[PDB]
Design an enzyme around this catalytic site. Sequence first.
Site, short mmCIF file in Angstrom:
data_model
loop_
_atom_site.label_atom_id
_atom_site.label_comp_id
_atom_site.label_asym_id
_atom_site.label_seq_id
_atom_site.Cartn_x
_atom_site.Cartn_y
_atom_site.Cartn_z
N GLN A 1 26.53 -20.49 7.43
CA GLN A 1 25.06 -20.90 7.21
C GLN A 1 24.20 -19.61 7.48
O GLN A 1 23.24 -19.15 6.91
CB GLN A 1 24.67 -21.97 8.07
CG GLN A 1 23.19 -22.37 7.89
CD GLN A 1 22.66 -23.14 9.08
OE1 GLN A 1 23.74 -23.97 9.81
NE2 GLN A 1 21.38 -23.73 9.41
N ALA B 1 33.65 -26.20 9.76
CA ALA B 1 34.50 -25.96 10.99
C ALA B 1 34.02 -26.65 12.10
O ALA B 1 34.67 -26.78 13.17
CB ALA B 1 34.37 -24.54 11.02
N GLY C 1 31.43 -21.58 13.45
CA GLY C 1 32.87 -21.77 13.24
C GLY C 1 33.33 -21.29 11.93
O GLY C 1 34.52 -20.65 11.68
N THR C 2 32.46 -21.31 10.88
CA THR C 2 32.50 -20.75 9.79
C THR C 2 32.44 -19.21 9.57
O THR C 2 33.19 -18.57 9.07
CB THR C 2 31.73 -21.31 8.63
OG1 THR C 2 31.94 -22.76 8.63
CG2 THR C 2 32.03 -20.78 7.16
N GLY C 3 31.46 -18.87 10.10
CA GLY C 3 30.97 -17.41 10.27
C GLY C 3 31.69 -16.55 11.16
O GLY C 3 31.59 -15.12 11.18
N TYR D 1 14.01 -20.25 11.28
CA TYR D 1 14.77 -19.37 10.73
C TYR D 1 14.38 -18.29 9.77
O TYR D 1 14.84 -17.30 9.45
CB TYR D 1 16.04 -20.10 10.17
CG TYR D 1 17.10 -20.60 11.23
CD1 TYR D 1 17.27 -19.71 12.16
CD2 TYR D 1 17.50 -21.64 11.09
CE1 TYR D 1 18.20 -19.98 13.19
CE2 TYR D 1 18.53 -22.11 12.06
CZ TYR D 1 18.98 -21.43 13.14
OH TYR D 1 19.67 -21.96 13.85
N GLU E 1 29.74 7.21 4.70
CA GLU E 1 28.73 8.06 5.43
C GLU E 1 28.40 7.31 6.70
O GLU E 1 28.05 7.83 7.82
CB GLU E 1 27.50 8.51 4.79
CG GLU E 1 28.11 9.78 3.63
CD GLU E 1 26.90 10.37 3.06
OE1 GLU E 1 27.11 10.98 1.94
OE2 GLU E 1 25.66 10.35 3.56
#
Lengths: 282, 422, 438, 54
Positions: free
Chosen positions: C11, C99, C144-146, C224, C254
């Site tokens: 998310q 998740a 949990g997903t991230g 957000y 670089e």
Amino acid sequence: MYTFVVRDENSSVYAEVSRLLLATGQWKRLRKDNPRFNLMLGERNRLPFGRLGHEPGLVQLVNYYRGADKLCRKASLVKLIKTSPELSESCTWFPESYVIYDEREVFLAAYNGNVWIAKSISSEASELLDFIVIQKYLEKPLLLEPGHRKFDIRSWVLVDHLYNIYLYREGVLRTMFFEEFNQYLMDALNTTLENSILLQIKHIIRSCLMCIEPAISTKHLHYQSFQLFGFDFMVDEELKVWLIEVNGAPACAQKLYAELCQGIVDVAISSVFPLASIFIKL
Amino acid sequence: MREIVHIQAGQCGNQIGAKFWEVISDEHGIDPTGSYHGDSDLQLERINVYYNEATGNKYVPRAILVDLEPGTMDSVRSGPFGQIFRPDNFVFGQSGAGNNWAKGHYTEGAELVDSVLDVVRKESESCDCLQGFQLTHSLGGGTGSGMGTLLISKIREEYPDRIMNTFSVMPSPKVSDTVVEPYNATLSVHQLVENTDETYCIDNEALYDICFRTLKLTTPTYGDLNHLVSATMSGVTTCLRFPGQLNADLRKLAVNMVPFPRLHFFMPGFAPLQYRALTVPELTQQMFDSKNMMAACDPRHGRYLTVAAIFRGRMSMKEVDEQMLNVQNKNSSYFVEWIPNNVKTAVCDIPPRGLKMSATFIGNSTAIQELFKRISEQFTAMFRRKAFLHWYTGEGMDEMEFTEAESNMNDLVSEYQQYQDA
Amino acid sequence: MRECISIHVGQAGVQIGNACWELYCLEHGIQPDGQMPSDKTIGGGDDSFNTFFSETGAGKHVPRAVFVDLEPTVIDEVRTGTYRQLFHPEQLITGKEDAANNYARGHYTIGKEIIDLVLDRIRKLADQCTGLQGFLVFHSFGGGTGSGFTSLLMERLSVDYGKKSKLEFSIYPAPQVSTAVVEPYNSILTTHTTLEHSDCAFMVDNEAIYDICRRNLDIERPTYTNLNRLISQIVSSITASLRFDGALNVDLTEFQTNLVPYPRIHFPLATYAPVISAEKAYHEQLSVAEITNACFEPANQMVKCDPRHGKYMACCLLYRGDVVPKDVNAAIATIKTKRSIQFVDWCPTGFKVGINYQPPTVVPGGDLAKVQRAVCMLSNTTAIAEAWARLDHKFDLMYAKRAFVHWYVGEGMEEGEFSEAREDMAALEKDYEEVGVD
Amino acid sequence: DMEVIELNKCTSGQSWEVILKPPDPSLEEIQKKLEAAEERRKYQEAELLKHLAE
Ligand SMILES: Nc1nc2c(ncn2[C@@H]2O[C@H](COP(=O)(O)OP(=O)(O)OP(=O)(O)O)[C@@H](O)[C@H]2O)c(=O)[nH]1
Ligand SMILES: Nc1nc2c(ncn2[C@@H]2O[C@H](COP(=O)(O)OP(=O)(O)O)[C@@H](O)[C@H]2O)c(=O)[nH]1
Ligand SMILES: CCOc1ccc(C2=Nn3c(nnc3-c3ccccc3OC)SC2)cc1
Ligand SMILES: [Ca+2]
Ligand SMILES: [Ca+2]
Ligand SMILES: [Mg+2]
Ligand SMILES: [Mg+2]
């Protein structure tokens, strides 16, 4: 109702400070590992300055300045003065010092009254180097009468969160307080303590802190800081004040514990946490 | 789409289950006939969580009514919102439990336990994403207590990866029907420990003290006690029924509120319990007050492992965050220090009926041990003389099974005491 | 011309990606339907903006990004959003259940199911590249997903794309803006796994952005949207050199050469200035020297720490707007005589500067005011280890009591991975101490 | 005394450098990790289904 934690049991000064906070009925002492606090009396070695000011809805305050070890250490103090443009080598009130593990070849050049002293006393250079910083020992100090004895002057300095330098009016002489010492000067040397010695003292204290100010200032940080310092001075026969060392966690005189520790709460604690002068501002 | 299959068993479970469906139908704007008559689209954005959409754009509650006697379920059907429930979801026997956990879990109850699962399975096949199971019952009875735990054990066997949630009602000497209530409670708790993920301890003793001392009711009835539960269940499932900035899916609630697989018994709390509107600091003080606890446990006698609070209505969200952080800092001695930020708070913009704003409390406090202790004292008091055991042994049970339940519950108490001194 | 592919996991990664690609289209003058009037070469071209955009025959400029999330509820907002005609349907990958704030559930359980699909979708855009540089991963330490799926994704990307660099844009967990209490658990685990797969990771503490949006934007409770629109400004300044003609940080190589001397130590401390509120009517436009000096202010950093007590290893200054080389160097000289800038003895005390003539673009109707000049400092300070110190301390509080562990073991993960991930962090903090601390 | 080196100018902008003072597991290994965790889930569930069967 404010909260505070204790993480230094060996602290003799803050043992009284924490005692007065519980006597106000507006300060509560929590566990030593409880993150929800307003004031912190951390330890001397390896203080976690990183976990300060990261708790939501909590204005946190610590009784130490991060980066003040550059002034309270032997080798650091010598390095700080010689490498700072506002102090430099040509410093009037600081004795000739050299860092030895370096400045070994530099020391022998200024060596050639020739008595020094190493710390972390002998006229010969060879002995000193063999023992192991090396400071120029004041061979001609001021001697009190009667007694023909040596002494030194301790001054307690409190710097709040706004970096206002406060000097305690009541000093001590580890040979004697100011009131007795002032009378001796007016009767023997025909001068006052305010003019002859205290003036140079207020100069040394102010110059050191303003030198390291932009390195340890907590004006725009996520946590404020205050700290009580202990400067040790030396006076020669020419009535000149020399700087010896600076203590990070110094002690106080017995009869002055009640007055000094109260002042700490008033201008360094209550200034941030108000409830429901004995200091000379510099 | 996160759908929840609601199950209510026994006299108590159905009566408080019916009151639950009454309130949320009012919140989501659903008239007794099952049609929509709201005003906001927020009432239908997450309506598929508890309601199944019918043919004529109606909303039939995804609920299953279970009992061993038709005496209670016929009262629900003949109630204000009785024509909204699905006719096929009415599974009832005729014999009855007779306030017997043994009859509900082994003999009479097992004859109907498969009839319910046939409805459970049918309600699950229509789910795009089966969230979990919500059970509503009492532990001092026989149908809701005995067959209730049996359904849990049966469902877990069929659905091992689904979350199990119960609203267990605790028996009390003050509000009691029989003397074998501690027996049934002890046998039920043992089942809830091993086969459930979440359990809201609702003590009738606490519900009585609230009505008597706080609400000033000289003679509290069951209907009054159900109101406290009905408003509590409305607050707990607020984020689940209404779109929030936290996205609640029940499973997260289990991961966050339950630090240890055996310590999952929560303490509900509601505030206020009048025309004068309450302010934010007033709701917060009452929400953590002992007089608003519905588990009859003093929070000061224990420590909070995890704390979840929900605020409904239009209010200064900044001020809410301050008052919540205020309690944690003024009472840091009742929150464990080995779980950082163990107090979360979300705000719903849609208030319940009758109140412009309210606050519902959920806390996994270690002080819940007193609840199990009180039962253990009443259990052993009778069990040491083998009193009223012939009602159970005559159903095929042995004394060894009771002893195991006594030990399993006493070990549970030792765990709550273990982390209380951490 | 060498293309790049962005990856938005979870998310946090998706919504942040929305703020960036929105800002990207506003800087290149790209309409939400994909059309770009400025681009005269229809269907093809190898300009500076083709690295992040692909062109079709219809003239649509399709972003080279892939959105992946275990729940559809977040990406579905992009499917029916303003830029619904901007992305190709195969770029938006969604699963069933999430998740649930669990690393193990997103890395082992559900992650295994959808990992083969994502890589195949990434391969779709990889074949449309004549010379792919690497990847930009947008995720968070808390989710949990991230954290779970990202760690697994980063492993496979090192297998299928070994000669490709991978930069991260991670989001450090903050108590003010959090969703779970097991986030320190998820944070340590994804760090231990991705440490050997990440070349350069830019951390963004939510607490910092939250306090920046309160101090400068005068917002009580920042959403957000306010957070992402601010983070996008930082990401835009970093990737400006990739999307526009330049000489400094022109590729993803670089960034590692100019900021990462030690592979393990690849967490540069980002600092942006100035942050001006749009609601303000009368404002004084800060000069070049004023915004440069603000880079050494903790109140403008992405991670709250004190660089004064830490040692620098490499520093970069990225200017956007009316900025001339003469004023920049004049500012650097002044800063040295006021700030405690300490570099390590094994690195040149210097600054790499990049200037873009195009002023920072802001979202119309947003909360950020239009500025004539800005700057984003990229300094690899050893004082950024404070972020790990705080995080690992919260890890030790829970793990000492073995709290919330069974939720990870019940998903297939072993308890040994916790200690393994923790002993790795303890070695990481030791590295920072051997470099900065004397 | 600072020095500006590598000054490159372009329509989009210019850039330089100022100096102040001189000074992996394979696909198979990953599949083993995933299948080992999946197998432990099946084991823990088998012990659950066994316990319920008892
Ligand atoms: N800056 C920013 N941070 C976010 C945003 N969304 C979530 N976060 C942070 O990420 C943490 C966890 O949320 P996510 O990473 O988005 O979780 P997720 O991606 O939905 O994955 P799940 O755990 O399965 O729900 C929170 O504690 C937030 O601090 C966002 O939109 N912007
Ligand atoms: N709060 C509440 N508790 C109830 C109600 N009805 C019964 N109980 C409780 O349930 C116990 C009686 O068990 P009961 O539910 O009637 O047996 P069962 O339904 O056949 O399993 C008593 O201890 C009561 O405290 C009710 O309407 N409200
Ligand atoms: C202390 C540990 O940290 C947590 C993190 C997240 C949650 C979630 N809340 N949640 C859910 N379902 N009902 C709730 C809830 C219930 C009562 C009050 C407030 C609620 O939250 C709106 S899902 C996740 C809970 C605790
Ligand atoms: Ca029969
Ligand atoms: Ca083109
Ligand atoms: Mg009854
Ligand atoms: Mg999510």
